[PDB]
């Protein structure tokens, strides 16, 4: 198994501050994943944001997204910076792992981020 943990839990900020979350990978953290961040604004279906492969080495941004999103790690820790909130961006944020072959998919337990 891997354990995903997210960090922080929540996030009370306010527009045009700075929000950094991060995903730390456990357990078998030498296999295969992707290490995805989603954004899911309510009543939406997730969106994928960033993501870098486990064990391959540079981030991604996926199409169709601001500069406000930003990944920095290796693959057992993304973070996920969104520089200066835009209204919108306010929304639930998660990270999953999983592998090209879909034997395991793991998610966080979710960062909420608000006002």
């Known amino acids: 198994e891997i354990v995903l943990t997210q960090s922080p839990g929540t996030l009370s900020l306010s527009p045009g501050e700075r929000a950094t979350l991060s995903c730390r990978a456990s357990?078998?953290?030498?296999?295969?994943?992707?290490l995805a961040w989603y954004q899911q604004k309510p009543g939406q279906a997730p969106r994928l944001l960033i993501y870098i492969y486990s064990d391959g080495g540079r981030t991604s941004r996926a199409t169709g997204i601001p500069d406000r999103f930003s990944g920095s790690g290796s693959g057992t820790d993304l973070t996920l910076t969104i520089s200066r909130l835009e209204p919108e961006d306010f929304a639930v944020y998660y990270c999953?792992?999983?592998?090209?072959?879909?034997?395991?998919?793991?998610w966080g337990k979710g960062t909420k981020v608000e006002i």
């Open positions: 357990g078998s953290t030498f296999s295969s994943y992707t």
């Open positions: 999953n792992a999983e592998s090209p072959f879909y034997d395991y998919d793991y």
